[PDB]
């Protein structure tokens, strides 16, 4: 029926106290609210994830250590480095409750999908795709995307994970790399020295999960038209070969022109065409956020995509609201691609697609 929107004022406040995206959650919700899109959705308060729900993926030793160091924010504990806590993922005070709130919000969205409350459920504070079962990684302490998929596996027999973040969704792919019940598809920048360094087209999963991982390595400067051509080509073949019953879609906005990552050169319109293509499958769909470090452009992107989900065309002027002064110098919703080259050679892209086409022939 109506798409579910995972939201509460306390959840956004909890998300807002995050070292890496300060006030991002407030800016996203407040722009969505300023366009009145929340009136067209079913607002659902997130439950926080129990220990047993987090342990569907993460080990008990990791969870208990995260819980301990989160007490005083002790970031000198001797075992922290063994769990990936330190540089990118400091053991700050309250980090465990913060991670459990976000994980629980993604689980809540998945539970809404199982219960038939909706066919699209949105958590614009989720998508933390780097965390492994026993190790934090790339600013991710818990892998809410994995937790969401595992919740959807209570009902759905084949789940398609699509990861459109700038970065390779290595934590999700690693979680499911030995199984054929969950297919992972990631489009991402892949370049020697670019985080996390995995996800070449030759990485196709392991064992019984061989060919149930799809990786599309892409180079700097890609724009909307070519990105959609790649994405539609891959998802068309994946949908035919895999026949998913549900979809989890990670829509990190660090691909968008103006992001400090300064890598891809996308606008939300291009990401929106990929989203529209997945939406016409009419499957249960769990929508997650991800990266995005130009805060106004990130709000622009996820608001526009919320309008796409609702089939609404939005006014170009950013409406008057709390963060209006952040949308300069132009104060419009549309984003202009930067003037810099697309480094993607058409023949390399086509060779990549041919490989994936061959890998997918093996798919059942
Ligand atoms: C301005 N400054 C001090 C830095 C800016 C960026 C990074 C970085 O990319 N580090 C590598 C870890 C990247 C994690 C990416 C998170 C993400 O968006 N995943 O999808 C480091 C320092
Ligand atoms: K990705
Ligand atoms: K897999
Ligand atoms: Zn990213």
Domains, the chain: 1-364 (3.40.800.20)
State the Cα–Cα distance between residues 175 and 258, nearest whole angstrom.
32
Are 323 and 202 within 8 A, CB to CB?
no
Nearest-ligand number for the alpha carbon of 210 = 3
DSSP string, 66-120: HHHHTTTT----TTGGGGT-SSSS---TTHHHHHHHHHHHHHHHHHHHHTTS-SE
State the Cα–Cα distance between residues 339 and 32, nearest whole angstrom.
29
CB atoms within 10 A of CB 335: 20
Q: Is 329 helix (H, G, I), strand (E, B) or coil?
A: coil
State the Cα–Cα distance between residues 311 and 307, nearest whole angstrom.
6
Q: Could you give the C-alpha distances from 183 to 124, 159, 175, 252, in angstroms and in order? A: 22, 6, 11, 19
Burial class (CB in 10 A: 0-12, 13-18, 19+), 42: middle
Q: Which residue's CA is the nearest one to ligand 1's atom 15?
A: 138
State the Cα–Cα distance between residues 252 and 302, nearest whole angstrom.
9
Burial class (CB in 10 A: 0-12, 13-18, 19+), 284: buried
Let me know the angle formed at the C-alpha of 285 by 358 and 194, rounded to the nearest 5 degrees.
55
Contacts of 74 (CB under 8 A, 6+ apart): 68, 91
Q: Which residues line ligand 1 (CB under 6 A)?
A: 88, 130, 138-139, 165, 167, 195, 252, 254, 290-291
State the Cα–Cα distance between residues 350 and 304, nearest whole angstrom.
30
Contacts of 78 (CB under 8 A, 6+ apart): none
Between 9-16 and 95-114, two packed helices, what is the crossing angle to 10 degrees? 140
Q: Given the residues 65, 129, 130, 168, select the one marked as catalytic.
A: 130
38 among annotated binding-site residues: no
Q: Which residues pair with 247 in a beta bridge?
A: 160, 285
**Catalytic: 77?**
no
Q: How would you write 306-345 as a 3-class SS string?
A: HHHHHCCCCCCECCCCCCHHHHCCCCECCCCCCCCCCCCC
Atom of ligand 1 nearest to the CA of 129: 20
State the Cα–Cα distance between residues 211 and 229, nearest whole angstrom.
22
Experimental method: X-ray
88 among annotated binding-site residues: yes
Are 279 and 193 within 8 A, CB to CB?
no
Q: Which residue's CA is the nearest one to ligand 1's atom 8?
A: 195
């Amino acid at each position: 029926l109506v798409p579910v929107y995972i939201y509460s004022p306390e959840y956004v406040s909890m998300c807002d106290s995050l070292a890496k995206i300060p006030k991002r959650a407030s800016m996203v919700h407040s722009l969505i609210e300023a366009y009145a899109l929340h009136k067209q959705m079913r607002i659902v308060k997130p439950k926080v994830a129990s220990m047993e729900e987090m342990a569907t993926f993460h080990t008990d030793a990791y969870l208990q250590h995260l819980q301990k160091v989160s007490q005083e924010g002790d970031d000198d504990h001797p075992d922290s480095i063994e769990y990936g806590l330190g540089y990118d993922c400091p053991a700050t005070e309250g980090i465990f409750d913060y991670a459990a709130a976000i994980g629980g919000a993604t689980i809540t969205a998945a539970q809404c999908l199982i219960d038939g409350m909706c066919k699209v459920a949105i958590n614009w504070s989720g998508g933390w795709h780097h965390a492994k079962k026993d190790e934090a990684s790339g600013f991710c302490y818990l892998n809410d995307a994995v937790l969401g998929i595992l919740r959807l596996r209570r009902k759905f027999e084949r789940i398609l994970y699509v990861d459109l973040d700038l970065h390779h969704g290595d934590g999700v792919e690693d979680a499911f790399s030995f199984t054929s019940k969950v297919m992972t598809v990631s489009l991402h920048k892949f370049s020697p020295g670019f985080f996390p360094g995995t996800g070449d087209v030759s990485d196709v999963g392991l064992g019984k999960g061989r060919y149930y991982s799809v990786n599309v390595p892409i180079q700097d400067g890609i724009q909307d038209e070519k990105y959609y051509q790649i994405c539609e080509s891959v998802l068309k073949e994946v949908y035919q070969a895999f026949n998913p019953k549900a979809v989890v879609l990670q829509l990190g906005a660090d691909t968008i022109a103006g992001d400090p990552m300064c890598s891809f050169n996308m606008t939300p319109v291009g990401i929106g065409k990929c989203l529209k293509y997945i939406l016409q499958w009419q499957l249960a769909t769990l929508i997650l956020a991800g990266g995005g470090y130009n805060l106004a452009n990130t709000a622009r992107c996820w608001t526009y995509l919320t309008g796409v989900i609702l089939g609404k065309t939005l006014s170009s002027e950013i409406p008057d609201h709390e963060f209006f002064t952040a949308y300069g110098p132009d104060y419009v919703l549309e984003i202009t691609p930067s003037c810099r080259p697309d480094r993607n050679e058409p023949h390399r892209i086509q060779q990549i697609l041919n490989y994936i086409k061959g890998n997918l022939k093996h798919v059942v």
